[PDB]
Amino acid sequence: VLRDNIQGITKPAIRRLARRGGVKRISGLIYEETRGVLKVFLENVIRDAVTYTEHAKRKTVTAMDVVYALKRQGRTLYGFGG
Amino acid sequence: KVLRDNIQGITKPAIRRLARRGGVKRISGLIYEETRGVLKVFLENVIRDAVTYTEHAKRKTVTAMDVVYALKRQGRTLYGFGG
Amino acid sequence: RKESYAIYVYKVLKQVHPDTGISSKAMSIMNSFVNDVFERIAGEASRLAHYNKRSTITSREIQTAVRLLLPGELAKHAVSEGTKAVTKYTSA
Amino acid sequence: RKESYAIYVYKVLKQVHPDTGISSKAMSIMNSFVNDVFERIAGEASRLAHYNKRSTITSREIQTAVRLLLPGELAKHAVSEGTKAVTKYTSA
Amino acid sequence: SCECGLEVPKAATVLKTCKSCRKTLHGICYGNFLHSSIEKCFTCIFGPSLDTKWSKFQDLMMIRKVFRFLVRKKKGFPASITELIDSFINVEDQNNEVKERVAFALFVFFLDETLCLDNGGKPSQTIRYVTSSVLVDVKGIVIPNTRKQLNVNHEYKWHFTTSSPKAESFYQEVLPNSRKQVESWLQDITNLRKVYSEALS
Amino acid sequence: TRAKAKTRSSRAGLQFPVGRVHRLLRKGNYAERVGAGAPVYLAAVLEYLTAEILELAGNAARDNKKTRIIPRHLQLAVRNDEELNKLLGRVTIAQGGVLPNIQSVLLPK
Amino acid sequence: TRAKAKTRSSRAGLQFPVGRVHRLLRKGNYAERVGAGAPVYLAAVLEYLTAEILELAGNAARDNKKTRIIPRHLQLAVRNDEELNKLLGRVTIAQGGVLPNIQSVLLPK
Amino acid sequence: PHRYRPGTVALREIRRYQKSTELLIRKLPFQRLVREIAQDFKTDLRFQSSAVMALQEASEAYLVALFEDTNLCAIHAKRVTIMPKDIQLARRIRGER
Amino acid sequence: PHRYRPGTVALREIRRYQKSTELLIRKLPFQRLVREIAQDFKTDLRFQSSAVMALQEASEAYLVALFEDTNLCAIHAKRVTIMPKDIQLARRIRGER
DNA sequence: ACAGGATGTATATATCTGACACGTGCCTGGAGACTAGGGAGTAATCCCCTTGGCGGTTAAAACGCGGGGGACAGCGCGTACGTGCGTTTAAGCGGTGCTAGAGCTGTCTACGACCAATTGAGCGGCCTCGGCACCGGGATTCTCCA
DNA sequence: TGGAGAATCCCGGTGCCGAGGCCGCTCAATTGGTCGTAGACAGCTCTAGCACCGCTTAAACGCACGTACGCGCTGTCCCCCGCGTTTTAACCGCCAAGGGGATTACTCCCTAGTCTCCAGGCACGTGTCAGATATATACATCCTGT
Ligand SMILES: [Zn+2]
Ligand SMILES: [Zn+2]
């Protein structure tokens, strides 16, 4: 059983994402709240992906299952099959 | 007859009533001019699609269902008028 | 000859509140609500069959589409209601 | 046996830039672009026939659906290209 | 209240009104006017000397009634004569006199080429016609030109039209205008009655 | 001979029609064939959601001391509930109004 | 006998297939019947849009002194143009990056 | 005289207009604006009575929801009055601009 | 020593990371997080290699776009640093919260 | 307002290598040639709904003026955040080994489409009464200044 | 901390128009039987997912230092709110003329269905050149003292 893997998203990694966004100076409480936002995003997408898998009677999650889940929420992705 | 300068029909007292329902307590003096510009852009997009549906059916009258279809395409569903 | 759900909505109202009425304007809103939900579920079930290369819409497609649309506990109670009706229909 | 638009996209490229290539990753993105636009236009034309109680999809449905989706001058140039092809096909 | 004096089923016609005397009128009796208000009716135009009990007036009303009913139905002639009679006349008011009047109206229609019999095809190549099969059940129908009766319990193909090149004006115009027109119409009705009497015996 | 006639709704103990729903699915360009149990499942779901809204609307009318439901009462039921609010998140109800809400900073002190 | 065989694309002077598009429309549950001129109209529209993107992408590659098109070049063409940006307003392109942009207030003074 | 202090009447109007469900724009002036705009797309058009009413219902709902987002932006900057730059920020974040 | 003044290096990193197209999160730690979340919905699941890569592409694009809206809110209040209350306002206006 | 040291970035040259452009063989799907029937266009008629004009009464928009309080700029202070250096740690890469589940054929039966005859449930028309809006009067409460 | 005064709430009596219930009938749902194909079930093959181990070095981590950004406090003054007058146009009845939507039979051309057959497109090899990787050099920008 895996546990406490949310800490893998380190402090230096978050700063790199902010730099590409165009942020110059960062507070000290940003890192804790960013982890919470990311966790909520993944739960919604993964829940729909598993639902497609069970309907097809399979035990492996494929790339097309992820693409269909994203499109339903309004975020189309180009590049991975489709 | 050609209509003109009807955007001034939206008076200053009317805009304040809309702001009060929104929950606004104090208003600046330059809000009224910019609000008229925002409303005009909104109507142009909706009316353009409504006329397109009318021409496809070969009619000269705009019906209530034409407006409902136009709103739904943009992502604003309306309940109450047919549909 | 036009069709609507007005007759059937009124029957459900008498089971919940036996002595409450409804106005004509509110009746139109409820009629539009039923048509809107009908198209969401039916449209989603159509794509499920296309992905898996099937030619039939069955109870499985309807059940899966409900879980994708309805949020939280609404989906949990809706599934039990649908399953309960099908087994009773098959027996009789 | 899988189908794609890779053969046809490459022909168009040689008309515009005669001496430019393309990588495999970029080819996949262009393939997904064509399928996406196909479903938007075809899906919209289906609803136009349903509203007017018709059973056929003709050139009028395709033309109207283009003007609803494409913005600004893209729609203006697309209509002329489609009309030009149909009249040439009818003559021959 | 109408000058026809009979009762019409609700589905057959649409009600109208006169502006002056403010009384209900039959739509089919006046030619299906555009608006629901009419300035003057027959009583207003003619005056106190208009006796509605004259046979000519009743025959005129019956002819106009039948023509307007057939025109507004937009389906041609019905299957049987009794079906038409039951459709636009109540059962209680149905007697022998109205049957004779209907037969006279049918004879007049046949005379003016409004209603034509099928020989080998449609009569005209330009004027629109509607073809239907009619089973004859009543007795007393006379074809004008051939001067022969029609057999009972037999079916024939009939043609019907609206804009005949030659038709009488008393069932073609919409509304009355003056008293001279009405008396001319009555004289024409008298002449048609004389012709029918001389052709029947 | 023929043994009477029972509606398919009665065999399932429902109030919403089943025969009508089956016809709409077939003449709607959804799929080539339609199964037998699909109309029964879909009819039950629609009935459940309808009873959910009507119960909350009736409570709002009682608090206002009225015996009829108007569009204002439907607005209050949907927006106060959390699940129904998320479902109808992009829907406008005619003659509905808004919920009373004032920011705390604006209040007098 | 039979007089050779000409593709329907050649009769219209196009590069995209017409026979294939006709089959997809029929086996797609869109309508009961499909007209004859519909596939020709739709094929021409798809070809026009494809040539529009490829022309802009080729210019970007030339500015960077390369002879191949990579996903980075497709991103630059779409975002710089105004019409194409509005069309693909909710689309993510893998390995695309972002446009260079820095707010003026952050610059040193 | 008995003058109310500034801001007292304004709070009283907020409670009044959040309790009703009527329309807040004069009907006749709004109708003329709709017909003027439609002249560009096509000439000699006719409207149904209920068609115009549908447009007015959707328009007012759009503006009321916009003022709620504008109000939040003003408080974020420690102010009470709303200003034109608050409207522009709300539309930019929302995605319209 | 030759110490750069504060803010000089930060501007240099902005130009560097707006010019490349690589991923900015370590691949191995991200994979373990995905498998842990999926345990709740169903047990004993297997993933394709390209399935995990699709999730990482969409996740980073979501976060980068969020920081742009957060930056605009901070400037509206006459500040330079970003704070937690700026993230909350952006999500509220956008419609997620 | 400069000078010069110090650090970071762009340019020209020389070797490798694996991904892309091109050729060959094979077969499945699109084109050619017919026929049959029904889907949509057209003309004549019916009839209701949108548009324009006229007059009167009163609700609402427009204007003016006095104050009050909120927006805005300037200044000072304490500390949280950026930059640089040394030590520790898992990420990344190249192997080896094994088995679970994806993907493809072949056989056959239960299930959904389709047709003819029968009948009862839902739609349109009509009456009828009571739920709610309006008006007038008294009672209660919230704001403001001494 | 106390009175005035204005705004809001509560009760009873009238009347009218909209919601609820009944009936005729017609069209859509139900019952019974036939035929053909979609999908369920069983078996097999080989792909790709999982597990483990050793090694090198790049990225993560902890700590010292100080300067720049955030936050609180004070003073100006300008712009918006509240209330009384005067004026303009929305709102409500009634009437009239005409435009355009809806209905129905007639007529004809266009699309679906079927059989034969052969080129256009896909899967599989092969080599070579565009891009990747080091190295030496030239130029631009920052920061402290003058
Ligand atoms: Zn009469
Ligand atoms: Zn009269």
Author numbering:
A (entry chain F): 21 to 102
B (entry chain B): 20 to 102
C (entry chain H), D (entry chain D): 30 to 121
E (entry chain P): 331 to 531
F (entry chain G), G (entry chain C): 10 to 118
H (entry chain A), I (entry chain E): 38 to 134
Show sentences the authors wrote.
In S. cerevisiae, the HORMAD protein Hop1 mediates the enrichment of axis proteins at nucleosome-rich islands through a central chromatin-binding region (CBR). Here, we use cryoelectron microscopy to show that the Hop1 CBR directly recognizes bent nucleosomal DNA through a composite interface in its PHD and winged helix–turn–helix domains. The Hop1 CBR comprises tightly associated PHD and winged helix–turn–helix (wHTH) domains and directly recognizes the bent DNA on nucleosomes. In S. cerevisiae, the HORMAD ortholog Hop1 contributes to axial element integrity and acts in the very early stages of meiotic recombination by mediating the recruitment of the DSB-forming endonuclease Spo11 and its accessory proteins.
In our structure, the major Hop1 CBR binding site is between SHL 2.5 and 3.5, on the outer edge of the nucleosome-wrapped DNA. The S. cerevisiae Hop1 CBR binds DNA through three loops, termed loops 1–3. Loop 1 is positioned in the PHD domain, with the side chains of N362 and H365 interacting with the major groove of base pairs 25–27 (as measured from the nucleosome dyad axis; all DNA base pairs noted are for the major Hop1 binding site spanning SHL 2.5–3.5). Loop 2 is in the wHTH domain, with R402, K403, K404, and K405 inserted into the minor groove of base pairs 28–31. Finally, loop 3 is in the HTH-C domain, with K452 and R458 binding base pairs 32–34. Overall, loops 1–3 define a ~10 bp footprint for the Hop1 CBR on the outer edge of the bent nucleosomal DNA. Notably, despite sharing a common fold with canonical DNA-binding wHTH domains, the Hop1 wHTH domain binds DNA on a distinct surface compared with these domains. Moreover, we do not detect any density for a histone tail bound to the Hop1 PHD domain. Together, these findings point to a model in which the Hop1 CBR recognizes nucleosomes solely through a non-canonical DNA-binding surface on its PHD and wHTH domains. While our identification of two distinct binding sites for the Hop1 CBR on the Widom 601 sequence suggests a degree of sequence specificity, we do not observe any sequence-specific interactions in our structure and can detect no sequence similarity between the two sites. These data suggest that binding of the Hop1 CBR to nucleosomes may be driven mainly by recognition of the distinctive bent conformation of DNA in this complex.
